[PDB]
Symmetry: C3
Subunit: 457 residues, 3 copies
């Protein structure tokens, strides 16, 4: 006997309603097997992978991850793949959970402007990755061609207050992290498994700040978590909380009460969270340079009353979250576009630098630039800064140590180098500082910084 | 009390019969503990890691992975290691599952032309990796010195229709992937965990095409899956199917109904599959550049009747499998040897290029070179190709975009660069194309391509 | 209802007694919830990461990993973080297991010379990583800012004979492995997840030789195993044994009878071992170049009677353990310091080289330099060595093959290159050999080797 042996499809054919991340379709709420028609369209298009950083994504349904599909174990799924006429590449699909060679791949090969279809029975309950399976497959996956299909058990999943859709991926750009412009895919980095970005939902900040997930104290939250890869395994973790349950794919095993759990490349899990105290809870890859240096952070923000008996402390801030502990960094996008257009103003730079200063510089120098007398020197009304703006460029790029005097007080400490900041970022941060806190104004350009980087002091 | 406390050995001493991958010895089918004599001989020898790519493997029993050993929990194992006189290095063994320092290592040190022996009781049921433990250990493991030992539970494993033996490893050559010739081990790549090949059973294609594993619809298949490493963790997955069961080593835990599962470096698992519909099912490392760019794919081919109610679609093809969706690529081996001998003919190149064209080029240009009018230009009877063979070399290496005219029709699309193809591969593919489909014949040499690669247009 | 709902704190406030690795505080042995006051002080200081290799660690309590904290589920923990006045950086803490944003991070921000405090209820039993959460977070973690907190179940863990504390981390130095001197942190290696050292407890040899963990035949050993990362996932394994139990964090799942288990970055597990036969049992990351080329090995040494019915073989030696199968390598530290001081003697070099010869050279040439006639040539009273010391430098760096004659006998084999040895290591090893076994004495300097490395023969 095969699994999912619930008889022939009954009722009427159902046209599946698919959702865009981070949302999920409603529970199927059905006690009979059905014929479910799924229509998914591939679109190739530029989107912002980071502020001022464009990338040509290849998408299922216009998003990364692709549209979420929700069916019932025992359903017959008639799957239609369309490839938008604007596409340059052929595409196809392999749905994990399908019983059949390639998970659908051979019968879903679809050239630009064409459509394909195939039918499969969903024998297997579980959460499953789907992805493109077109040579070169790794390229297609790296460009964003992955999503999730949920095959519900016949009785449905237990009721929760919220369901969300979060999917990790590793990305490979020719340029370095936060280097502006349209970035090509980089095959060499991809083969070496050396991503420049590691993201949830296709972009830096996709699920931070004003794009956070939400719930309230006392509520339950289910998250369908995918790892599209192509290559990385996620040390998937929630900062400041625990997972009530973690279940991989359609596995019989359910782990309970864990905070950190390994999601294979191509894998998927369902996690459950119960909100207990208010604040921001961070989903990360705890291979932690991915989370805090490459973009792999997402936020579940919980509203409600503090409970001092459980936690006396404060909400997260830029010390931990960095520059993602603001609503957004739109000013960076604006400054980058103004640079391209040749219309970059001092204020454009100031606002971009303000965004970028948070965490990156404020951890030591404070959000108001005051520092801590004798420990961290001030950027506010800083004689040392004003005396030599080129020196300040060198300090950001190359660090500073040894005894200095700032505003009449001696410091004898170490500012590490910050060479990974791009020329525009250094320029904008320093322009912000110069135009704040009674400093002398003026500006630093990306070209100024490029020159200092090419010839350290 | 110790585990495996089944009393002294009884009956007669048993001389273990070991098997070469991908086969397994028969079930022990025994209700009493025995003295089991195991004899394993190390052989160092060149073998083909890929077509036309030689490597000096270090082996247990002449194969990678090494010979499979099958005993019963509670057995006393008298283990004899011989090192063939042709060896240059000393060798030894650490069997996971042994209770004792080094898993046998100190007492199994064996110089070329010598033999060692030690005795251990198999206290622990499970599937376990064994490997060489001779300084530099990572080098010995990277050269192929690993295999599996099964310690059966006293009652035996449940009956299945087929048992197979599959073992992943990461390999480190001085040359790049598919660069021909005898490739040395590369210590720097190994320390950095940057393999050039990631393989099942010691070679590209070891378990694809005419070397696939076989079963029939309705049958059960058990696979003993090892990960010799040295360094990688496998996101081990079956495309188009599910694992009924996954059990790691001798663990009490058994996961059921999962498709993707993480196998540690040095780890091993037993998986179970039930054949439901015909076609090819791909075992991969779903860190997917390993599978589709470095060789980490193996096939279980299922024969029997289609069931359109479960899967309406077609068997896998070269779009997904690439150039491994043919029986073999023997023509590549032949062309490489002819190059070495100085006897390379046009036909040698043609046949090699035919093999390599599959997936790599046919995904877009089709297996008959017809392309898709207005979308993918033809290689068949291509005026554009014929007009400038050197341009064609540049297109393969460096890509092509922008408006072109081919056979009277405009194209305005993107062919990505394929710079990872080696000079001989480009040469052979283009010679195949030139000698097909009414194209003008002639040939492209590896030296021609080398020159274009050194000076792009 | 919240987990850990055992009522208000009762009894007297308890001042937690924290322990330094590899030791653990006693079981809490308490049946009521308490207010537990924890005081932890950050200290930045140089320590030896390897012999003659200094590193500026950032520590919780002066050690890597940081002091171990032990409380009971349901306790109220008043956590005090002090930052020593000598610090240059601000610091804070995120304790996994805390219910609240950042695991404490925002409320524990502590500038040099300051103190912070916050209160949390331990709702969640389990073993948990704590770490610094100060921008740049990955830098702080990479510098050593991590440890473990145990939250006991209310009834306590089962009694065992020994409890130990072992924590893996990946480290990123500007210099290569075993390159001497004060090594800076290397941000580029860290972002790329390319560590130069992978260690247990903050140093090479921290838990080997005379610093091994101890137990006796018949005893049970519990190890609290952390993985601070920042980036690597451990294929955590015990050579020559098995884990009776493995439990991750506070998970309900317990795996039994496994030898190899994957610990996520930021993860923690409790393992249990039962000593059965005497000898050294090696805890490793079985991504095995980490263990045997980067330092990721620790020893549990078991004393007691051999049991030939279970294991007939010998204790581990330098073939497997390499140069860590001696009590210590103090002579390397001494030679390095003498070099710095300009007082390096021949004997200083000899003793350092003696330490380094073990495994590295003795595997083939034997500990007495005799080799194996006709198979491995002698270093003892070697005419070939004496005839050309510069040739010997080239042989170590670059290898040797082909027919040679040594002490009247022909060899025709292969000595692989050993280019990863540093100039001082080559110099000291060869000085040891030259001053042993009736060889002619004299010395080889690091400068001599530097010259040969820059111009191979
Ligand atoms: C702590 C880890 C710091 C971070 C992050 C940043 N800075 Fe810093 N900065 C720090 C110290 C301890 C010092 C003094 C070094 C010494 O030799 O004692 C500095 C110094 C500066 C200066 C010069 C002095 C002054 O004007 O106050 C500048 C202009 C400066 N720092 C700028 C700066 C910016 C823009 C940062 C983010 C990109 C930044 N710093 C981070 C400590 C730390
Ligand atoms: C799709 C992803 C492709 C793959 C894989 C390969 N080619 Fe291609 N090729 C493709 C396109 C869209 C184009 C036209 C680009 C444009 O500017 O519009 C091309 C073009 C060629 C040509 C030149 C035109 C012609 O003769 O038809 C050649 C000679 C060619 N391609 C060869 C070729 C070979 C040998 C391939 C495998 C190594 C290969 N292509 C792959 C799309 C794609
Ligand atoms: C086995 C894998 C070896 C290890 C490890 C080391 N050596 Fe070696 N060495 C080995 C062989 C097989 C040979 C002969 C090569 C041949 O062409 O047949 C050698 C040779 C030497 C020599 C020269 C000959 C002699 O004096 O005996 C020297 C000086 C030498 N080896 C030194 C040496 C040192 C110092 C090592 C550790 C750093 C070392 N060898 C390791 C095999 C192996
Ligand atoms: Cu695609
Ligand atoms: Cu897949
Ligand atoms: Cu060996
Ligand atoms: Cu091992
Ligand atoms: Cu810190
Ligand atoms: Cu953490």
């Amino acid at each position: 006997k095969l699994p999912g042996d619930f008889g022939p499809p009954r009722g009427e054919p159902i046209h599946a309603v698919l959702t865009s991340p981070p949302l999920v379709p409603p529970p199927v709420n059905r006690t009979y097997p059905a014929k479910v028609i799924v229509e998914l369209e591939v679109v190739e298009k530029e989107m912002q992978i980071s502020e001022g950083v464009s990338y040509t994504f290849w998408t299922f349904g216009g998003t990364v991850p692709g549209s979420f599909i929700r069916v019932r174990q025992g359903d017959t799924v008639e799957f239609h793949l369309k490839n938008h006429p604007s596409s340059k590449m052929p595409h196809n699909i392999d749905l994990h959970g399908v019983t059949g060679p390639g998970g659908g791949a051979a019968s879903s090969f679809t050239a630009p402007g064409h459509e394909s279809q195939f039918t499969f029975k969903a024998l297997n309950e579980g959460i499953y990755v789907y992805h493109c399976a077109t040579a070169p497959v790794g390229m297609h996956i790296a460009n964003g061609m992955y999503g999730l299909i949920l095959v519900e058990p016949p009785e449905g999943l237990p009721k929760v207050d919220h369901e969300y859709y979060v999917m990790q991926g590793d990305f490979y750009t020719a340029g370095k992290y936060r280097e502006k412009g349209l970035q090509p895919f980089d095959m060499e980095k991809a083969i070496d498994e050396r991503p420049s970005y590691v993201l949830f939902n296709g972009a830096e900040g996709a699920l931070t700040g004003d794009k956070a997930l939400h719930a309230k104290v006392g509520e339950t939250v289910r998250i369908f978590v995918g790892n599209g890869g192509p290559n990385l395994v996620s040390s998937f973790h929630v900062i400041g909380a625990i997972f009530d349950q973690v279940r991989y794919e359609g596995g019989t095993n359910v782990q309970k009460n864990v905070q950190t759990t390994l999601i294979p490349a191509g894998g998927a899990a369902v996690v459950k969270f119960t909100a207990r105290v208010p604040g921001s809870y961070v989903l990360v890859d705890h291979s932690i340079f991915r989370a805090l240096n490459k973009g792999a952070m997402a936020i579940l923000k919980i509203d409600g009353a503090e409970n001092k008996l459980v936690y006396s402390g404060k909400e997260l801030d830029s010390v931990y979250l960095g520059d993602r502990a603001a609503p957004n960094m739109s000013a960076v996008t604006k400054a980058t576009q103004a640079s391209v257009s040749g219309t970059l103003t001092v204020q454009d730079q100031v606002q971009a630098g303000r965004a970028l200063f948070a965490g990156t510089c404020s951890v030591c120098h404070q959000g108001n630039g005051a520092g801590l007398p004798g420990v961290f020197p001030p950027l506010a009304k800083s004689d040392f800064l004003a005396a030599d703006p080129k020196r300040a460029m060198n300090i950001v790029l190359h660090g500073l140590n040894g005894k200095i005097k700032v505003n009449g007080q001696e410091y004898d400490s170490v500012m590490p180098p910050m060479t990974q900041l791009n020329d525009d970022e250094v320029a904008n941060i320093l322009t912000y500082v110069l135009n704040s806190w009674d400093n002398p104004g003026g500006r630093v350009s990306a070209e100024d910084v490029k020159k200092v980087r090419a010839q350290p002091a």
